[PDB]
Scaffold this active site. Structure first.
Site, PDB file in Angstrom:
ATOM      1  N   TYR A 509      29.585  43.689  33.884  1.00  0.00           N
ATOM      2  CA  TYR A 509      30.186  44.620  34.874  1.00  0.00           C
ATOM      3  C   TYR A 509      29.225  45.523  35.408  1.00  0.00           C
ATOM      4  O   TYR A 509      28.694  45.544  36.740  1.00  0.00           O
ATOM      5  CB  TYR A 509      31.174  45.561  34.180  1.00  0.00           C
ATOM      6  CG  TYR A 509      31.925  46.534  35.281  1.00  0.00           C
ATOM      7  CD1 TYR A 509      32.945  46.378  36.095  1.00  0.00           C
ATOM      8  CD2 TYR A 509      31.423  47.990  35.132  1.00  0.00           C
ATOM      9  CE1 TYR A 509      33.483  47.210  37.083  1.00  0.00           C
ATOM     10  CE2 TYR A 509      32.098  48.874  36.182  1.00  0.00           C
ATOM     11  CZ  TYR A 509      32.904  48.543  37.063  1.00  0.00           C
ATOM     12  OH  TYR A 509      33.529  49.622  38.021  1.00  0.00           O
ATOM     13  N   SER A 592      34.830  42.913  40.669  1.00  0.00           N
ATOM     14  CA  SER A 592      34.651  44.227  41.101  1.00  0.00           C
ATOM     15  C   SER A 592      33.212  44.431  41.181  1.00  0.00           C
ATOM     16  O   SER A 592      32.429  43.788  41.677  1.00  0.00           O
ATOM     17  CB  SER A 592      35.227  45.433  40.314  1.00  0.00           C
ATOM     18  OG  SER A 592      35.482  46.372  41.017  1.00  0.00           O
ATOM     19  N   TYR A 593      32.562  45.817  40.530  1.00  0.00           N
ATOM     20  CA  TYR A 593      31.240  45.955  40.375  1.00  0.00           C
ATOM     21  C   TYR A 593      30.561  44.477  40.094  1.00  0.00           C
ATOM     22  O   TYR A 593      29.564  44.114  40.481  1.00  0.00           O
ATOM     23  CB  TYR A 593      30.927  47.011  39.633  1.00  0.00           C
ATOM     24  CG  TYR A 593      29.603  47.707  40.390  1.00  0.00           C
ATOM     25  CD1 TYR A 593      28.282  46.955  39.797  1.00  0.00           C
ATOM     26  CD2 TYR A 593      29.322  48.873  40.926  1.00  0.00           C
ATOM     27  CE1 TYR A 593      27.209  47.600  40.083  1.00  0.00           C
ATOM     28  CE2 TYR A 593      28.161  49.433  41.376  1.00  0.00           C
ATOM     29  CZ  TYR A 593      27.034  48.725  40.718  1.00  0.00           C
ATOM     30  OH  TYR A 593      25.841  49.384  41.059  1.00  0.00           O
ATOM     31  N   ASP A 670      44.068  43.567  48.717  1.00  0.00           N
ATOM     32  CA  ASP A 670      43.093  44.477  47.982  1.00  0.00           C
ATOM     33  C   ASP A 670      42.987  45.871  48.880  1.00  0.00           C
ATOM     34  O   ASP A 670      42.279  45.623  49.779  1.00  0.00           O
ATOM     35  CB  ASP A 670      41.910  43.881  47.746  1.00  0.00           C
ATOM     36  CG  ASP A 670      41.390  44.493  46.535  1.00  0.00           C
ATOM     37  OD1 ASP A 670      41.376  45.631  46.213  1.00  0.00           O
ATOM     38  OD2 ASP A 670      40.487  44.000  45.896  1.00  0.00           O
ATOM     39  N   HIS A 702      43.518  44.292  43.813  1.00  0.00           N
ATOM     40  CA  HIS A 702      42.219  44.377  42.863  1.00  0.00           C
ATOM     41  C   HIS A 702      42.484  43.771  41.533  1.00  0.00           C
ATOM     42  O   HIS A 702      41.723  43.194  40.952  1.00  0.00           O
ATOM     43  CB  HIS A 702      41.821  45.843  43.018  1.00  0.00           C
ATOM     44  CG  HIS A 702      40.335  45.775  42.753  1.00  0.00           C
ATOM     45  ND1 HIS A 702      39.348  45.313  43.329  1.00  0.00           N
ATOM     46  CD2 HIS A 702      39.759  46.263  41.429  1.00  0.00           C
ATOM     47  CE1 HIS A 702      38.272  45.426  42.873  1.00  0.00           C
ATOM     48  NE2 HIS A 702      38.335  46.054  41.786  1.00  0.00           N
TER      49      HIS A 702
HETATM   50  C1  LIG Z   1      36.486  58.193  33.534  1.00  0.00           C
HETATM   51  O1  LIG Z   1      36.929  58.310  34.725  1.00  0.00           O
HETATM   52  C2  LIG Z   1      36.765  57.337  35.546  1.00  0.00           C
HETATM   53  C3  LIG Z   1      36.296  55.854  35.287  1.00  0.00           C
HETATM   54  C4  LIG Z   1      36.079  54.746  36.238  1.00  0.00           C
HETATM   55  C5  LIG Z   1      36.202  55.072  37.707  1.00  0.00           C
HETATM   56  C6  LIG Z   1      36.609  56.398  38.057  1.00  0.00           C
HETATM   57  C7  LIG Z   1      36.823  57.358  36.842  1.00  0.00           C
HETATM   58  O2  LIG Z   1      37.493  58.817  37.294  1.00  0.00           O
HETATM   59  C8  LIG Z   1      37.409  59.102  38.851  1.00  0.00           C
HETATM   60  C9  LIG Z   1      35.851  54.379  38.705  1.00  0.00           C
HETATM   61  C10 LIG Z   1      36.835  54.223  39.666  1.00  0.00           C
HETATM   62  C11 LIG Z   1      36.168  52.950  40.749  1.00  0.00           C
HETATM   63  N1  LIG Z   1      37.030  52.766  41.867  1.00  0.00           N
HETATM   64  C12 LIG Z   1      36.386  51.591  39.925  1.00  0.00           C
HETATM   65  C13 LIG Z   1      35.926  50.725  41.188  1.00  0.00           C
HETATM   66  C14 LIG Z   1      36.535  49.784  41.506  1.00  0.00           C
HETATM   67  C15 LIG Z   1      36.268  48.994  42.380  1.00  0.00           C
HETATM   68  C16 LIG Z   1      35.067  48.857  42.984  1.00  0.00           C
HETATM   69  C17 LIG Z   1      34.055  49.483  42.658  1.00  0.00           C
HETATM   70  C18 LIG Z   1      32.645  49.636  42.906  1.00  0.00           C
HETATM   71  F1  LIG Z   1      32.267  48.372  42.598  1.00  0.00           F
HETATM   72  C19 LIG Z   1      34.475  50.578  41.571  1.00  0.00           C
HETATM   73  C20 LIG Z   1      35.152  51.835  38.930  1.00  0.00           C
HETATM   74  N2  LIG Z   1      35.507  52.950  37.983  1.00  0.00           N
HETATM   75  C21 LIG Z   1      34.647  53.165  36.790  1.00  0.00           C
HETATM   76  C22 LIG Z   1      35.585  53.571  35.778  1.00  0.00           C
END
Ligand SMILES: COc1cc2c(cc1OC)[C@@H]1C[C@H](N)[C@@H](c3cccc(CF)c3)CN1CC2
Ligand SMILES: COc1cc2c(cc1OC)[C@@H]1C[C@H](N)[C@@H](c3cccc(CF)c3)CN1CC2
Ligand SMILES: CC(=O)N[C@@H]1[C@@H](O)[C@H](O)[C@@H](CO)O[C@H]1O
Ligand SMILES: CC(=O)N[C@@H]1[C@@H](O)[C@H](O)[C@@H](CO)O[C@H]1O
Ligand SMILES: *[C@@H]1O[C@H](CO)[C@@H](O)[C@H](O)[C@H]1NC(C)=O
Ligand SMILES: *[C@@H]1O[C@H](CO)[C@@H](O)[C@H](O)[C@H]1NC(C)=O
EC number: 3.4.14.5
Lengths: 728, 728
Positions: A509, A592-593, A670, A702
Site C-alpha cells: 500500500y 489504490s495508493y 470509480d 473503487h
Molecule cells: C484514520 O482516518 C483515515 C484513514 C484513512 C483515510 C482517511 C482517514 O480519515 C479522513 C484515507 C482516505 C483516502 N481517500 C484513501 C484513498 C483512497 C483512494 C486513493 C487514495 C490515494 F492513493 C487514498 C486512503 N485513506 C487511508 C486511510
C-alpha cells in the site's frame, strides 16, 4: 496430506471469523444480536433479556437493514430501502416503532429518501436531513420543524457532508452534532457552487438504452474547494409558525484570510463547543472554544482560549488534527499531539492557558485515547515490546502520570498482540477485542479492578476447522536501512523450507501513515497464494509509513512517489538476498495508493520485479482530490509544488514498462480514483508501444466489491500471477 | 524466398502498394500529383504540363491539407487546419488563391472552422457551411450571401448531415447539391431537436484535469429520429439588400404519413431534380421528379412521374435505394433494381411510364452503373466466370441490349479479376484500375474503339521486392451447403503442404451485403499470420452476404445473429474436415459486425472454436443506431420485432463462454458502436463467472486508427493468437 486454503475458500468465505458486535446503552448494559433477536446484557452479571423479538417485523413487509434505539428506550428506528452512495453516504426510508406500545407510528413519518437521521444523546428527539435540509422532531408522532431552507442537490449541503468532506475529513456522511443535553443541534453547511464536476458513464442493467452520465462535485488538486459555515440552533425553542433561528459561529480571522476547512466538532459541556479549523495549506490549524451566552442567545469564541497547532515537518495530525477529550467540567482536555522528538503523545491542555503538558513520552506512539474519567485516561499504543505493529490498551493515573498499567499486554501474549476496545458510559466496563496474531478473542472486563469477567467469542469453531487445513504462517520482523528499523511481514507457505527457493509477491500500500506490517490475523488472498500456490506474500513498511514518529512518516512530505517507492524496491532487493526467495520470481501488487506505487515501481527500471498488478491506481496527483493530495503535496502551482506534481506521474515512466509484465485494472464507476487515472496510464503505455494487460470493470467503483466482480478480479489476478511464476 | 512478411512489415508499411490518383477536369484532361507537384495530363496525346509547382506554397505559412481547383481553372481552394469529426465530417480553414493573377485573396476570406466548401460544377461560385448555416459566394473576393439563419449546434443542420445521415445514409458530411448549371443550390435541412444524446468521456492530453463529456445526437434502435426538409435556392437571383428565398420541396403524401428519410438527391437537368425517400420501415421507397416552373418560381413534383420501389423479402436496395442515371434530355434514366428472380440488374425507366425495362439479366448482379452516353451504358458486374468476388467493366449497346461487350475480362486474365473504373467528363476516356488477384495495375483507355492507351502504374517496384519475401498464396473457391454455392477464400502459408495440419484463424465480418471472399490483393495482418506464423486465415460468405441476389442476402431479414452466425460455424466445420486443418486450433475474430458475429459464435456452444477476438462488437441491437438496425430488424416494439431484438444479444449467451478463451477490445471514444456495447458484454461475463481478457483503448474511436494505437492493437492480438495456438 491435509486440504489446502484455496481461492474458493477465500472467495466463498468457507472459514468465517466470528465477531461480537455490541452497543453499550448505559454504564452497565449492552445491546447484542443473537439469532436475530436484539438482546440486552447486564455486564456485571452476564444475564440477558430479549429487547426486541426476532419474529417482530415478520409482517412488516420490508427487508430491515438496520435498527436504532432512542437513548431513553421508548422507540426504535427501522432503517430500510438502503441505497448506498459513497464510502459512508446512503439514502434510506424510516419508520418508528413505539415500544411502550405494539405500534408503528403512522403520522408524520420520516420521508422516504432521507440522507441521515440521529437520535439526540438523551430522550427521543430526532434530527434528519432530507433533500439537503435539516428537520427536527421533538416527538416521533409529531410534525417536524424545518431548520434550514437553502438546501439544493449538488450545491448546498445542510447537515450532511459533500464528497471530499465525506471522504477526506469526517469519514462520515453526517454533519450534525447534538449537544450532550439534546438542547442544541450544531451543524455544518457546505457550498459546492463553484466546485468543478467529474463526469462519467454508468451503464446499468442491459435495458438501459442510453448510458447515464454521473455528475459529482469533486475538487481535484488545485481546483476550487467547497466553503463551510458552522451553525447552532436551540432545539428547545422551536415555533411551528416562526422560522427557526440558527446562530452562526464564525471561523477565526486567521482562517478567514484564505481557503480553509472545518476539521473537528466536539462538544465540551452543555454550553461549550470545540471547533478545529485547518488552513488549505495543512500546516496550520486552530481550535476555537465557544461558550453559550444565556443573555444574548449567542455563541462567543474568546480569542484568549484559541489553540494553535502547526508542524514544521509536514501536515497537522495523522490524517487530520486529532480530537480533544474534555474533562467533565470542560475546562481542560487531552489531545494527541506530535512531541519535540516527532512522536505522537498525549498532551494535557488547560483552556485559558497557552502550552500543554505531555502525559506520555517515548520512542513509540499513542494511537488513540479511548476513555477518560476523573481517575484515569485509557489509551491504545504500540509501546509493547517496541512493536509498531502491535496494539495494546493502557491506563494512566491522573493523580500521577508515571503510574501506567498495561491492561491487555499480558492477557494472552502469544495469541494476542492487537487490541481495540469499547467502554461502557463512564467506563464502568470495557470489551477488549483481540485481532491477532492468533484467532480473534473477545472478552468483557470490569474497570474497578481490571478483573476479567467472561469470554464472549473465542472463534473455537474456526480453530477446529482450521486444524484440518494446511495454514500458512506469518513472520513479523524488521530490516535496517541507513541505520533505521523498518518492519515487514511475510506470509510463508505451510511446511516452509529455508533451503528451497520460493516465488515472492510484494504486497504494497505504502501511502502516508500506512501500516502493512502488523500483528493481525487475516484470511485473504495472500492466505491462498501461500497455502495452495506456495507463494511468499511480503509487505514492507517504509518511509512515509505511520505510527513510528514523524522522522519516518513525514520523510515523504511534499514528495510523494519518491522515498516510499525506492524503499519498496529495497525491501525486495533485500528479501532477494535471503536464501529462500527465487530472485527470478518476484512480483508486486497493490490497490489504490497500492496501484500507484506498484506502478511507480514497475516503471522504475530496477530490474528487480518480473511483473506486477495495479488495481485502481492514482497515476497523477492532479487527478486526485484536493484535501488528500494537497495535504502531502501542497498546491500544483509553479510557486508551490507544480514541479514535483509533474515528476511523480505513472505516465512519465512508460518507457521502462517494456521490461515487465503489467496488469492494469480499474472499475468504470470509480467516484474516488477516477477511471481517467488508468485511462491515462494505458494511453501513455500505448504511445510508447509497450504491451501490457488490462481489465475494466463495468459499473464497479473503487472497492470492485460487488459479489461477482470481487470473485472475478481475484480469479483474474490469480491466473496472472500463477502464469508469471510458471505455476501449474 | 528467405525473408518473411512480418508483423513489423504490416505495421510500418515496408511494402507500399503504389496507386494512381487522377481527377478528370474535362473530357480529355486530368490532374495528377507526382511527389508534390500538380500535373495535368492529356488523355489523347499523352503529353503533360505542370499545373502547380510544389514550391508554389513555400511562404504560405500553413501546412496545406488539400486543394480544390475550380471548374474554370481560375481559382484554387487551399484546405488547412484540418480537424476530423466522424467518418466523413471534419472542420477546416480555407483560403482561395487566384491562379490567373498569382495572388492570395485577402478580402472576405472563408471563415475558420468551416464544415463544408464546394465549387459549383461549372464556373467559380462557392457554397460553404459554417456554424450550421449555408453561405454562397458569387465572386471569391466578394461578400457572401447568407442563405439560412436557423442553424444551431446539434439541433438544426443546414446543408450538412447529422450523425446518422452521415454514417447510414449519404456517407458524406455534405448535404448540398448544385444543379449542373451552377444556377441552383439545393440542400437538405436536418432537425435533431428531440433526438436523445449518446454521452461518453473523452480524456485528452495528460494535462486535462477533468475529462470532457462528448454529447452526440444519436438515435438508437426505436428512438426519436431526426427530421428532414429539402430546399432549393436560386443562386443567380441573390440580393445584398433582401434575403434569400429558399423554395421547399416537400416529401410525397405517401411519405409524410409517418417517419421517413431523404434517401437520395440526383439532379436530372438544369431545371429537373430527382429525390428518393425511404419509409422508416425500409421496405418502401419513392422517387419524385421535380421541374422548375420558370415564371412562378416554385418546383413541382407530378405524382405521374412518381416511381415506387418496394421489397417483399427484405429492405430496399443494398444499403439504400440505388442511384438514378439520367440521359442528357432528362426524360429517362437507368437504375439498379432487384428483379423478379431476386438479382440486381439495370432497369430502363422512362419518366412518365409504368414499370421499367430490364436491360441486363442472369444469375449475377450489376455492381454499379459508371457512365452514360448516347449509344452506350458502362457498368461493373460480377458476371465473369460465374464469380461473385470478381468485378468487371461492361458495355451495353442501347439500340440493342443483347450486344454486351466485356471491356476488361480478358485484358490480363490471371493478374486482374477485380476492376474499378473512372471515366472522363463525357466518358471519352477511362482509367481502369485492377486490385487482384495479382498486383494493382492502372491503365488508361479511350472509349472510341476501346483502345488500350497507356500503362499508368504497374507496381513493378513492389513486385521485385515481393519475390524476395516468402509470400502466402490466396485460394478462392466455394462449398455446396444446401444446394447453394457459398464462397470462401483462404490465405495459405508459403511452402504449403496438404498433409501437414495447420491452425486456422476464421476472419469474420458477415454484415448484411458483405463480401469477404473476393479476388482483391491485400498486404495486411492475415498476410503476416500466414507468412510468419503458418496460420491459415479463412473467411466465408454465408447467408446475408451480398452480390449473389436476394435469396442469400435477404435470408437474414428481420433476423440478425441467426443464419449469418450458423453459417460461419458451418464453414469452419467444413474447413475442419479438409485434412490440412488442425481441428484443435481454430480461432475466430472480427471488428464491428465481425466482433458481434465472433462473439455470437463463441457463445453458441458449438465446440468448434478454442478462442476468439472481438473488436468494438455490437452486443444488442437496441444499442446501435436506428437507420442501420431497423433496416434489418424493424422496430423494437412487441407488435413488430422486439422478440428477436431480445433473442440476439451477446449477453444472453454469456454462460457458454466458459468453453473458450475470449479477448474483447474497444475504444473509449467510439461514437459509432458505443463503448457501452462491450461494457455490457464484460458485465454479463463477470455476472456469470467467466474469465476472459480485455483491452480498452483510451480516446480511440471505431477504427482504432491512430498509428500508435493501431500498432498496439495488432501487436496485442498477435500475442493472443500466438499463445492460443501454442506458438513461440
Ligand atoms: C484514520 O482516518 C483515515 C484513514 C484513512 C483515510 C482517511 C482517514 O480519515 C479522513 C484515507 C482516505 C483516502 N481517500 C484513501 C484513498 C483512497 C483512494 C486513493 C487514495 C490515494 F492513493 C487514498 C486512503 N485513506 C487511508 C486511510
Ligand atoms: C456501399 O455503402 C455502404 C457500405 C457499408 C456501410 C454503409 C454504406 O453506405 C450507407 C455500413 C455502415 C455501417 N454503419 C457499418 C457498421 C459500423 C459499425 C457497426 C455496424 C453494425 F455491426 C455496422 C458497416 N458498413 C458496412 C459497409
Ligand atoms: C438485562 C437483564 O436481563 N437484566 C436483569 C434485570 O432485569 C434483573 O433485575 C436482574 C435479576 O433478576 O438480572 C439482570
Ligand atoms: C428550425 C426548425 O425546423 N426547428 C424545429 C422547431 O421549430 C420545432 O419546435 C421542433 C419540434 O420538434 O422541431 C425543430
Ligand atoms: C454559495 O456560494 C455562492 C458563491 O459561490 C453564492 O452565490 C451563494 O449565495 C452561496 N449559497 C449559500 C446558500 O450560501
Ligand atoms: C500537350 O502539348 C501540346 C503541344 O504543345 C499543348 O498544346 C498542350 O497544352 C499540351 N497539353 C497538356 C495537358 O500539357
Amino acid at each position: 496430506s491435509r486440504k489446502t486454503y484455496t481461492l474458493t475458500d477465500y472467495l466463498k468465505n468457507t472459514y468465517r471469523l466470528k465477531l461480537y458486535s455490541l452497543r453499550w446503552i448505559s454504564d452497565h448494559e449492552y445491546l447484542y444480536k443473537q439469532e436475530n433477536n436484539i438482546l440486552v446484557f447486564n455486564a456485571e452479571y452476564g444475564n440477558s433479556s430479549v429487547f426486541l423479538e426476532n419474529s417482530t417485523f415478520d409482517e412488516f413487509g420490508h427487508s430491515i437493514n438496520d435498527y436504532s434505539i432512542s437513548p431513553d428506550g421508548q422507540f426504535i428506528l427501522l432503517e430500510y430501502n438502503y441505497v448506498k452512495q459513497w464510502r459512508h453516504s446512503y439514502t434510506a426510508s424510516y419508520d418508528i416503532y413505539d415500544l411502550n406500545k405494539r405500534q408503528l407510528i403512522t403520522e408524520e413519518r420520516i420521508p422516504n429518501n432521507t440522507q441521515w437521521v440521529t437520535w439526540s444523546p438523551v430522550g427521543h428527539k430526532l434530527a434528519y436531513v432530507w433533500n439537503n435540509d435539516i428537520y427536527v422532531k421533538i416527538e416521533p408522532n409529531l410534525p417536524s420543524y424545518r431548520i434550514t431552507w437553502t438546501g439544493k442537490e449538488d450545491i448546498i449541503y445542510n447537515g450532511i457532508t459533500d464528497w471530499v468532506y465525506e471522504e477526506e475529513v469526517f469519514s462520515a456522511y453526517s454533519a450534525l452534532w447534538w449537544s450532550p443535553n439534546g438542547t442544541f443541534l450544531a451543524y455544518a453547511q457546505f457550498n459546492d457552487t463553484e466546485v468543478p464536476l467529474i463526469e462519467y458513464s454508468f451503464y446499468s442493467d442491459e435495458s438501459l438504452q442510453y448510458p447515464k452520465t454521473v455528475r459529482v462535485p469533486y475538487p481535484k488538486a488545485g481546483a476550487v474547494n467547497p466553503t463551510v459555515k458552522f451553525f447552532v440552533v436551540n432545539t428547545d425553542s422551536l415555533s411551528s409558525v416562526t422560522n427557526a433561528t440558527s446562530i452562526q459561529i464564525t471561523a477565526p480571522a486567521s482562517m478567514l484570510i484564505g481557503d480553509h476547512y472545518l476539521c473537528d466538532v466536539t462538544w465540551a459541556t452543555q454550553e461549550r463547543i470545540s471547533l478545529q479549523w485547518l488552513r488549505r495549506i495543512q500546516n496550520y490549524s486552530v481550535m476555537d472554544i465557544c461558550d453559550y451566552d444565556e443573555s444574548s442567545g449567542r455563541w462567543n469564541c474568546l480569542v484568549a482560549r484559541q489553540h494553535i497547532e502547526m508542524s514544521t515537518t509536514g501536515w497537522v495530525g495523522r490524517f487530520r488534527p486529532s480530537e480533544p477529550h474534555f474533562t467533565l467540567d470542560g475546562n481542560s482536555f487531552y489531545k494527541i499531539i506530535s512531541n519535540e522528538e516527532g512522536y505522537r503523545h498525549i498532551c494535557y491542555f488547560q483552556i485559558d492557558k497557552k502550552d500543554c503538558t505531555f502525559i506520555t513520552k517515548g520512542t513509540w506512539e499513542v494511537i488513540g485515547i479511548e476513555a477518560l474519567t476523573s481517575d484515569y485516561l485509557y489509551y491504545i499504543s504500540n509501546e509493547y515490546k517496541g512493536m509498531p505493529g502491535g496494539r495494546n490498551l493502557y491506563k494512566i493515573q491522573l493523580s500521577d502520570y508515571t503510574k501506567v498499567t498495561c491492561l491487555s499486554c499480558e492477557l494472552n501474549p502469544e495469541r494476542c498482540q492487537y487490541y481495540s476496545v469499547s467502554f461502557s458510559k463512564e467506563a464502568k466496563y470495557y470489551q477488549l477485542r483481540c485481532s491477532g496474531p492468533g484467532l480473534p478473542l473477545y472478552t468483557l472486563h470490569s474497570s474497578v479492578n481490571d478483573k476479567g469477567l467472561r469470554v464472549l467469542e473465542d472463534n473455537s469453531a474456526l480453530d477446529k476447522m482450521l486444524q484440518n487445513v494446511q495454514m500458512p504462517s506469518k513472520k513479523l520482523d524488521f530490516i535496517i536501512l541507513n541505520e533505521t528499523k523498518f518492519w515487514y511481514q511475510m506470509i510463508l507457505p505451510p511446511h516452509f523450507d529455508k533451503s528451497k527457493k520460493y516465488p515472492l509477491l510484494l504486497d504494497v500500500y505504502a501511502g502516508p501513515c500506512s501500516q502493512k506490517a502488523d500483528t493481525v490475523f487475516r484470511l485473504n488472498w495472500a492466505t491462498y497464494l501461500a497455502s495452495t500456490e506456495n507463494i511468499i506474500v511480503a509487505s514492507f513498511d517504509g518511509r512515509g509509513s505511520g505510527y513510528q514518529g514523524d522522522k519516518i512518516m513525514h520523510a515523504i512530505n511534499r514528495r510523494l512517489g519518491t522515498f516510499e517507492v525506492e524503499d519498496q524496491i529495497e525491501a525486495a532487493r533485500q528479501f532477494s538476498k535471503m536464501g529462500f526467495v527465487d530472485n527470478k520470481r518476484i512480483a508486486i501488487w497493490g490497490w489504490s495508493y497500492g496501484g500507484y506505487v506498484t506502478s511507480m515501481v514497475l516503471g522504475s527500471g530496477s530490474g528487480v520485479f518480473k511483473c506486477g498488478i495495479a488495481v485502481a491506481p492514482v497515476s497523477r496527483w492532479e487527478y486526485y482530490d484536493s484535501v488528500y493530495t494537497e495535504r502531502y503535496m501542497g498546491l500544483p502551482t509553479p510557486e508551490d509544488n507544480l514541479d514535483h506534481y509533474r515528476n511523480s506521474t505513472v505516465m512519465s515512466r512508460a518507457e521502462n514498462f517494456k521490461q515487465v509484465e503489467y496488469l492494469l485494472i480499474h472499475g468504470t464507476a470509480d467516484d474516488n480514483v477516477h477511471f481517467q487515472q488508468s485511462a491515462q496510464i494505458s494511453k501513455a503505455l500505448v504511445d510508447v508501444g509497450v504491451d501490457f494487460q488490462a481489465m475494466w470493470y463495468t459499473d464497479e467503483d473503487h472497492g470492485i466489491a460487488s459479489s461477482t466482480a470481487h470473485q472475478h478480479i481475484y480469479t483474474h489476478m490469480s491466473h496472472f500471477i500463477k502464469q508469471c511464476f510458471s505455476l501449474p
